[model samples]
Target: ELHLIPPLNFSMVDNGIFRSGFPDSANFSFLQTLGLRSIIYLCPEPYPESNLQFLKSNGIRLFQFGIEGNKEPFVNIPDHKIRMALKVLLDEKNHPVLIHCKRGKHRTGCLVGCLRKLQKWCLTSIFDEYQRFAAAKARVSDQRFMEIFDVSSFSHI
Candidate 1:
């Protein structure tokens, strides 16, 4: 029997998009089952060599958008980068893609929130999904960013 261990906070975001915390060796077997075509990594740190090898061996592509997860009172999540990441994420060629951050909360939440906005989901619904993952660590600034994010550009996508 094969044992598969999913990464922390793993969840399906939509038809072919998934989200989770950073994945490691133990989760590799489980990840393989998803037949992921690419990964959208949201941290500035480099992926561990082993993880890189895993991606290479599995023929999965990586799209890294080094967003800082700052805890400072005032910090901004770059709109341009998020926009770029969203562009990659929205592409069906990257379907079965996995989006992940260190803990799968703030950065990932904000990105997913923006995605929800583009999906035409209401603010309350977006916040609800984000809060569900962020829980006690939910930041008002993240929600603010989501609220102010302009998704009209992606309306056609």
Candidate 2:
């Protein structure tokens, strides 16, 4: 169920980082070979040793957004923290950044979906991108997750 979605590949000229789902050490190496250099992990931590080692060895930098397991998924996370995390990801000027939650479904999708909304992408396009996770078997459900990203107040059209 846990998998990494490799973002669009580009020639080394681009500085934007790719945001993908949670990756194991093997996946990390594969992504490294593909030129990813940074990761945003949204899983509750105590990360696997192998993955940690791989990151250290490959010189990949990581930022952790730890979501405690017992916290209520809908209400526990403060709005400010979520905004801060999204801001950090969106503000990055570095190339090949990967963002991931446990299954690349709820948490990761929420973040990306919010960004898509901010960029003024249509709902259909946002939903389509979210659906890709289901196609990849990385998501079991998308409805609730997708709804969390709605920011209709910001709409100009």
Candidate 3:
């Protein structure tokens, strides 16, 4: 149940991989009923006022990655931050986790890609999965953006 947020492009929604962006109380309520306990929010927070109080009141734990806009160079993502977020996600693996970013293409895609490599998924397989995810939301109209981040660099684990 990896719920990537916003940027509902042709790729993501098409494959049913992308879920609601910044889920509201109602969305969370349905999720809770289905036994989901945590949300891994890759977007920056102070999330929108519409959903904050509801999230807190419902006892849903949130993990924020706070990734800024996507225009920055991919390599500029801070190593420390990536490590910290990955640690939290791995540590909390017991729950049905939902990971998300604003558009769910760049940042969320990057995190999922790394995790797949850690699980020893093949590079082509991982890239294909990402393409499906991107295509679901139509965020990846340009095939070149798919290759912007090197999957080989993530094969270490």
lDDT scores in order: 0.93, 0.59, 0.53
Pairs clashing within candidate 2: 15-95, 17-96, 17-97, 18-97, 19-99, 20-99
- What number of backbone clashes does candidate 3 have, counting pairs of residues 3 or more apart or in separate chains? 15
lDDT of 1 by residue, 67-133 (tens): 9768847868999888989999999999999999899898899999999998889999999999999
lDDT-better candidate, 1 vs 2: 1
- As for candidate 1, its clashing pairs are none
Q: Which ten residues in a row have the lowest lDDT in candidate 3?
A: 9-18
> Candidate 3 on 14-55: residue-level lDDT in tens?
211233344654455455443445556777667776566655
- In candidate 1, how many Å is residue 108 off? 0.5
| Rank list by lDDT | 1, 2, 3
What is the full ranking by TM-score, best candidate first?
A: 1, 2, 3
Candidate 1, residue 64: the lDDT equals 94
Residue 52 displacement (Å), model 2: 1.6
Query: What TM-score would each prediction reach against the true structure?
Result: 0.96, 0.66, 0.64
How many clashes show up in model 1? 0
Best by lDDT: 1
